[PDB]
Design a binder for this molecule. Structure first.
Ligand code: B6K
Ligand code: CL
Length: 313
């Protein structure tokens, strides 16, 4: 046989749905005029805020949002469900075009709670890793700790995900698979890093003026990554969309409750590995089901394809 690099189109999405059932068609998120992706990696947070889901019960929110997403994928291609994984309200879905189904192997999913008592599932991460052709890929969906002052807990949450997430090994004599041990890592979710120092009315005003350079200079994720305390070697595209948190339900108004929570770029998509090229990075204002807005991104990722020759002598 022989081998070559081929670009396939990866969509990555993250959406914190605030414990709500889907009430809106998700084509605006998943298939907004773009070309049909080869792979869909769709992640959720706060799927179900009930006591029941928190204590590991099954939730109808799962099937509800799965169908919502299935129906939302690009109508020009037939998509195969590869894998679903959920811890409490953190759910990751992996689809691929039916063409590619035969070349997906070694699918493993795992979860890690980092919430109450540092081990429950109100916060944490879930991951699906797999081999597409001869490229190892791991997709991680995490919901890190809330609130401005808890940036150091968000750091630790990231650490625990990174050290506890262990995938199964076809060869038992080798060390278990960790997230790092992959050709391609996409990390998405409500990473929940807020705006430091600046006060609430400053932020909104700075957002109203669309100066996303000055606001970004005080973004906690940037800061911490700069201090090399989290996400070493990861990259993120330029943020050309306004903060994706926190809104009033059913509108584009900033949280008007008594908490009057400041805006933030809670919901992010980061990556690491070779031959990854980000084509877009967008939020989707139209969808008003949640107090967050959903965020998408499309990559051209170069996969190592091993194939058969045609008669060529
Ligand atoms: O790359 P891999 O390792 O697979 O090896 C090869 C397979 C075929 C091949 C094998 C077939 O089936 P079978 O071998 O019977 O399983 C085919 O179906 P067919 O028998 O229906 O004709 C075929 O026809 P298409 O071109 O794919 O239609 C091509 C040709 C190759 O080039 P060449 O012929 O120039 O040597 C070749 O490279 P190599 O030179 O390295 O051997
Ligand atoms: Cl499944």
């Amino acid at each position: 046989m022989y081998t070559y690099i081929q670009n396939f189109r990866f969509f990555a999405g993250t959406y914190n749905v605030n414990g709500q059932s889907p009430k809106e068609c998700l084509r605006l998120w998943l298939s907004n005029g773009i070309q049909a992706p080869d792979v869909y990696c769709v992640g959720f947070q706060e799927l179900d805020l009930s006591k029941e889901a928190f204590f590991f019960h099954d939730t109808p929110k799962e099937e509800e949002w799965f169908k919502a997403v299935s129906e939302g994928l690009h109508p020009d291609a037939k998509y195969a469900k590869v894998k679903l994984i959920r811890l409490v309200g953190i759910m990751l879905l992996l689809y691929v075009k039916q063409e590619h189904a035969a070349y997906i192997s070694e699918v493993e999913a795992e979860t890690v709670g980092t919430g109450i008592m540092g081990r429950m599932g109100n916060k944490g991460g879930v991951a699906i890793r797999f081999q597409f052709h001869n490229t190892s890929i791991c997709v991680v969906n995490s919901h890190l700790a809330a609130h401005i002052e808890e940036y150091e807990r968000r750091n630790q949450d990231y650490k625990d995900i990174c050290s506890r997430m262990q995938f199964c090994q076809p060869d038992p004599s080798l060390p278990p698979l960790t997230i790092s041990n992959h050709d391609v890592i996409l990390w998405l979710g409500d990473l929940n890093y807020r705006i430091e120092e600046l006060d609430v009315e400053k932020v909104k005003k700075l957002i109203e003026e669309k100066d996303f350079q000055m606001l970004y200079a005080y973004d906690q994720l940037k800061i911490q990554v700069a201090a090399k305390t989290v996400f070493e070697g990861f990259t993120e595209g330029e943020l050309t969309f306004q903060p994706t948190y926190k809104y009033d339900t059913g509108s584009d108004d900033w949280d008007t409750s008594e908490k009057c929570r400041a805006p933030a770029w809670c919901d992010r998509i980061l990556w690491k590995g070779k031959n990854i090229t980000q084509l877009s990075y967008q939020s989707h204002m139209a969808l008003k089901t949640s107090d967050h807005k959903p965020v998408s991104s499309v990559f051209d990722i170069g996969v190592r394809v091993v194939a058969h020759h045609h008669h060529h002598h």
